[PDB]
Design a protein around this ligand. Sequence first.
Ligand SMILES: Nc1ncnc2c1ncn2[C@H]1C[C@H](O)[C@@H](COP(=O)(O)OP(=O)(O)OP(=O)(O)O)O1
Ligand SMILES: [Ca+2]
Ligand code: NA
Length: 430
Amino acid sequence: GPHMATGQDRVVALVDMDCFFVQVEQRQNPHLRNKPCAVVQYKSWKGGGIIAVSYEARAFGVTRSMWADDAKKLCPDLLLAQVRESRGKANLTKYREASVEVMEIMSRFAVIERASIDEAYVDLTSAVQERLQKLQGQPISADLLPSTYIEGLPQGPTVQKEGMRKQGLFQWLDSLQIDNLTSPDLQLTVGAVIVEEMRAAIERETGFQCSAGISHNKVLAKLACGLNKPNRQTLVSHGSVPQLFSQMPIRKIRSLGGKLGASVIEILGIEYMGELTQFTESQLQSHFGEKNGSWLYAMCRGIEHDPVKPRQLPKTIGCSKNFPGKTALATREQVQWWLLQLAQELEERLTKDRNDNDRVATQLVVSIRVQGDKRLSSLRRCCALTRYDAHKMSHDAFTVIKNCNTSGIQTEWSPPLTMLFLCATKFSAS
DNA sequence: ATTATGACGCT
DNA sequence: AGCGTCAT
Ligand SMILES: Nc1ncnc2c1ncn2[C@H]1C[C@H](O)[C@@H](COP(=O)(O)OP(=O)(O)OP(=O)(O)O)O1
Ligand SMILES: [Ca+2]
Ligand code: NA
């Protein structure tokens, strides 16, 4: 009844760049603009592995994880840009620096949580309150929402995409109660107005287009963002949840894409998010644990409380390289040489981080995979990180893993290593 | 022979 | 601590 909280207290957005690494390459090389194109890493094995795909190229069926040689079979005119190689490994600096450009623009509008290299959550609750004051009961014009979709509309008693968008928006704005500063739907709408402004600023100042979701929490905002890509934003209201979730596969919701989501489906014998509403909170806790059960009970009702954390910078800085099949490292000299390459890249990034962000890492984590293990990581060990010096870091990393060498022979390494990873963690102000 | 990352949960 | 899950 009146005491039943509905998770409508906040306005949260998720802003995500469209085909991010591709846009970075298209900005730099105008010949790639408005073309089917993809970004690839390495080149020798099957033309390289695709890591980002333009929307033009997606229309041909090109996807992430595809080998470029195979992508070319679907899309013979596909254009490719290659990730830079330094010290024998892929170097993602150009994209990290592009990411910073976007995050700094978003930060002007509100506190953000960096969720990945190309996306951030935004807590707009206070910004919306402020804007509501300026508006002073004045209605919201569709002109302020030129790229916004209202999920679930139009509905009730044109055959073009943009036509439908506008009909939905009109129905939504027709129904709004602008006299109530505390209407959650009004708050979302003003939230969307602000996100239009944020997205315009990002595009003006960087050249990059993005999409966004606006809702009452991070999970719905993320889901919303994906509903209308590219270059559009989507408002998912609390009221839109029952119909949206009624046919929404469980795996689509963030954190349910893996084993947990599979177990929800298997154990409960359901397929869609909305079907979760028929279980009690205790029932869900019984199958999935106290924390997951409570989360599921609220989430299937559109309710989620995870805060937008005030964190714009990554918490760890890492460097990693695989050594698949016949390239696995089988000698001590090999292992030491590659640890050095990784350590040198890591030192470079750490030094820049210290200068830019007034902090120092204090722990070095070393991880390897051995040939045969289905797991991505086989062994992880930490040691102290007291100096930003690659030779020291590489020597220390070797020291902590050297006992893994099954080989009786000193110079040989067995089993061969198929992955090396160095990660700096535990930052302190400096 | 996806690869290169990065955040958070469990015990 | 070291491992596992999920994500981009
Ligand atoms: N599995 C991966 N391996 C390596 N790099 C990845 C992987 N997934 C994503 N990336 C990199 C390249 C992407 O351009 C960037 C952002 O990822 P993501 O947001 O999932 O897709 P995207 O921005 O390329 O397309 P979209 O428009 O669908 O969001 O991060
Ligand atoms: Ca993206
Ligand atoms: Na993303």
